Amino acid sequence: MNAKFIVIEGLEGAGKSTAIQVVVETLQQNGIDHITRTREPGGTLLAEKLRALVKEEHPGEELQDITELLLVYAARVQLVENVIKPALARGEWVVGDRHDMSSQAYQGGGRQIAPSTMQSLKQTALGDFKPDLTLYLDIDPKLGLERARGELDRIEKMDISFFERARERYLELANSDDSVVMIDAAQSIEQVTADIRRALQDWLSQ
Amino acid sequence: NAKFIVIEGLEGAGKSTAIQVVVETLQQNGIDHITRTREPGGTLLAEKLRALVKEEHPGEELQDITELLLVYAARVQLVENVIKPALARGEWVVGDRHDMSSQAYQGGGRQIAPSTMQSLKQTALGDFKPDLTLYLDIDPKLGLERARGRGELDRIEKMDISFFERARERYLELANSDDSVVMIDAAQSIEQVTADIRRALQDWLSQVN
Ligand SMILES: Cc1cn([C@H]2C[C@@H](O)[C@H](CO)O2)c(=O)[nH]c1=O
Ligand SMILES: Cc1cn([C@H]2C[C@@H](O)[C@H](CO)O2)c(=O)[nH]c1=O
Ligand SMILES: [Cl-]
Ligand SMILES: [Cl-]
């Protein structure tokens, strides 16, 4: 095995942090002890500042959808170039909390930004770079918002249909991509854990 | 018919005082309401983006593509919330830098290819463009010696000389191939600069109808 980038995806409330930890422990049980964890938007000083700009409301100013996409991308470029690519080049595996699949679902599906725009901006910012394995934790939008309880950011204040379109695109990508495996996240902790731990052990042996 | 006039040039070419000349000239020809803008900036979010772009970043390297995406992010905000709405109200707009700056600095300076610049331009701004542009040309060295007189130099103002040479070189190609861009010599004196701006501007106003 050589180093890989594994991404956890899904709506908020899908138990992403449980999944991250499951993924990490699996790799450890498999003799992989050098692992880097990341989150997006974020993971660098500047990326974290961009995350805060994206999650806040701006007074006397409408945050345009394209702006939103440009910002998540600017944060993505920083992470990929300063943290992710160098870790992989050194033989360190990277486990991330969201990556580009989130822009496709949130900005593509949710904001309804033209797919052609999505495609060319992904091209300019990332070229060909892509995760090696993504675990998309799928959950019903209302169930998910009601598990995220315990303050709603600018995106989390959007109406339900927004999350439904995000979900639909997440589903279109998950079925059309063999490097994406779907996990039913509305099960109990023992079971989400079993399916993640089983889809990854599985994937590794391949 | 509201117009959007942009003043361009390397930093230190004398942009702030050229906008004044432009503003006063428009005021003599009976143009009542004018909005002033600068880029990146001009909105609370745009200003925060300006600081991120102008500031250093010990801890990490700021990639050229990130820089490009941040100036366009600042631009989309300004254009959509301030320029277009002001133009719709019958107001003229005079801005300190616009897209030509991304072409000179990110395209020429950073050497990002024209097709990348051109597709990000389409994605962010569509076919929106200023009606007139005054490019104040100046020798790069002289440009930086003047900037220093205002205050400390930003991340970008600290690049080696060739960066500014490539940007100037790009501004000149653009000034030459575009009929809506007119070049002013900033090597001249304050009177001479003021006078060419006033005349170039004067001509353009008549040659409209
Ligand atoms: C990474 C990413 C996150 N988001 C949203 C979902 C919010 O919960 C998230 C904050 O992590 O910002 C996007 O809209 N697009 C993206 O590309
Ligand atoms: C508007 C704009 C400014 N800049 C530069 C000029 C100044 O505002 C600041 C420092 O040179 O950023 C760019 O590099 N690209 C741009 O598109
Ligand atoms: Cl979660
Ligand atoms: Cl200047």
Side-chain angles (χ1 to χ4, degrees), chain A residues 61-118:
Chain A
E61 183 173 8
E62 171 183 299
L63 205 167
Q64 303 298 306
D65 297 341
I66 298 294
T67 303
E68 192 178 71
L69 179 66
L70 292 167
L71 293 178
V72 298
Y73 266 108
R76 181 162 300 120
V77 172
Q78 292 295 111
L79 182 65
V80 167
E81 298 301 319
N82 289 315
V83 168
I84 298 171
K85 280 175 177 165
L88 298 172
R90 301 191 311 262
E92 269 195 45
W93 286 59
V94 173
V95 179
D97 180 359
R98 303 179 186 282
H99 187 62
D100 199 72
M101 190 171 295
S102 289
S103 295
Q104 306 308 312
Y106 288 79
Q107 284 63 59
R111 296 301 180 199
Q112 311 183 42
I113 298 183
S116 64
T117 294
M118 296 304 299

Side-chain angles (χ1 to χ4, degrees), chain A residues 43-55:
Chain A
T44 77
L45 293 171
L46 178 55
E48 288 296 344
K49 287 171 182 180
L50 293 166
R51 181 183 182 92
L53 293 176
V54 159
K55 291 167 69 82

